[PDB]
Design a protein around this ligand. Structure first.
Ligand SMILES: *[C@@H]1O[C@H](CO)[C@@H](O)[C@H](O)[C@H]1NC(C)=O
Ligand SMILES: *[C@@H]1O[C@H](CO)[C@@H](O)[C@H](O)[C@H]1NC(C)=O
Ligand SMILES: [Mg+2]
Lengths: 168, 202
């Protein structure tokens, strides 16, 4: 039972044996017997074992990455291949979906990842987004006074302050 | 709340780092174990057995290092969330008190601020409980050890709340104005606190 062991019933003698586990990257090619320790063999190409184990066959690797996913992790003796969505997309259902574009009047509020869509928010008062973008955040209105000009047209969610000079 | 989602995101990112680190260490040990059994394959049975014992000791050691490091991450996250909540509690309290020193007092307002300050104190308490619960799960002996400390903190939350109420009892017109909305707030609060002590003893 103890966690480095597994239980195995000798297929001829019927005896209940306590065998030692094999390392990850390996599987049991020969169970222990009355006289002998279990024998381990390396996972063949296209299979893997992630953990210490007492199993008779390595796990088949996942299918190769379906377009447009890319492989960050190859199939190897200790690892399943790992497929992820290319930049600017995220895992949706079983495929890749483009990141949500935050339109004019909106800016990124939570950045987009390979597992999670972009989250957008309405630019707050005093800021604006004049571009649809899945990465740009909201930008503060140009300070017109700060460069010795007047606000000739107040900014909105969608538009910057318009600076200018006026005569009277 | 953006602070909520953000703190959980930093905690999440820390966990992922930590697991990547553990996975690499484990992987290196498993490769070495396999190569060692390969080297020892023509030795006596007892010597092969010693190879296995050796590497199951390395593995056990790594696994406990990793468990330890995970608890450290949890502790760091809990502390941070506590700081966030302490802040919000202090803000609600100040707003309620300026609502209570406002002249003329508007009991609409006062009871609303009172509302949110009670909610803050509650969420503080909830966090305290959740921390203790986690400790109890992963480590009942430590939890048994720090219980006393938690109870005394809970008693602090009570006292602070009570004083906060007393302030309302200072300005009687407002108090009588909103007394039964206050009484129902304290109703469900009493229920919450009770729920918490229940979740505490087991
Ligand atoms: C087989 O197993 C028995 C116990 O079931 C043990 O005493 C014996 O030494 C083993 N080897 C033999 C019989 O060659
Ligand atoms: C709580 O504080 C108020 C103001 O001091 C007081 O009326 C009341 O006796 C106190 N109760 C307890 C249990 O501290
Ligand atoms: Mg935009």
């Amino acid at each position: 039972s103890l966690p480095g062991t597994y239980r195995h019933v000798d297929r001829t003698t019927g005896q209940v044996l306590t065998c030692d586990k094999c390392p990850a990257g390996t599987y049991v090619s020969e169970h222990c017997t009355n006289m002998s320790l279990r024998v381990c063999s390396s996972c063949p190409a296209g299979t893997f074992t992630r953990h210490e184990n007492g199993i008779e066959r390595c796990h088949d690797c996942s299918q190769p990455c379906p377009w447009p996913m890319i492989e960050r992790l190859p199939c190897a003796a200790l690892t399943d291949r790992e497929c992820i969505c290319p930049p600017g997309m995220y895992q949706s259902n079983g495929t890749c979906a483009p990141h949500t574009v935050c339109p004019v009047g909106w800016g990124v509020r939570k950045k987009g990842t390979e597992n999670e869509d972009v989250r957008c928010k309405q630019c707050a008062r005093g800021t604006f987004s004049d571009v649809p973008s899945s990465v740009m955040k909201c930008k503060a209105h140009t300070d017109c006074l700060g460069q010795n000009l007047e606000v000739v047209k107040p900014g909105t969610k969608e538009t910057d302050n318009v600076c200018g000079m006026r005569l009277f | 709340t953006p602070g909520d989602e953000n703190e959980h995101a930093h905690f999440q990112k820390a966990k992922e780092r930590l697991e990547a680190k553990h996975r690499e260490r484990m992987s290196q040990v498993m490769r070495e174990w396999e190569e060692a059994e390969r080297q020892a394959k023509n030795l006596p049975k007892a010597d092969k057995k010693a190879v296995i014992q050796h590497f199951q000791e390395k593995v056990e050691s790594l696994e406990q290092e990793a468990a330890n490091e995970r608890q450290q991450l949890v502790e760091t996250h809990m502390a941070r969330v506590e700081a966030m909540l302490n802040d919000r509690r202090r803000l609600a309290l100040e707003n309620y008190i300026t609502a209570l020193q406002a002249v003329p007092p508007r009991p609409h307002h006062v009871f609303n601020m009172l509302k949110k300050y009670v909610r803050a104190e509650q969420k503080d308490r909830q966090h305290t409980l959740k921390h203790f619960e986690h400790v109890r799960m992963v480590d009942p002996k430590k939890a048994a050890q720090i219980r006393s400390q938690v109870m005394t903190h809970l008693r602090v939350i009570y006292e602070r709340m009570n004083q906060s109420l007393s302030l309302l009892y200072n300005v009687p017109a407002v108090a009588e104005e909103i007394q039964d909305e206050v009484d129902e707030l304290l109703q469900k609060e009493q229920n919450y606190s009770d729920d918490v002590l229940a979740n505490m003893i087991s």
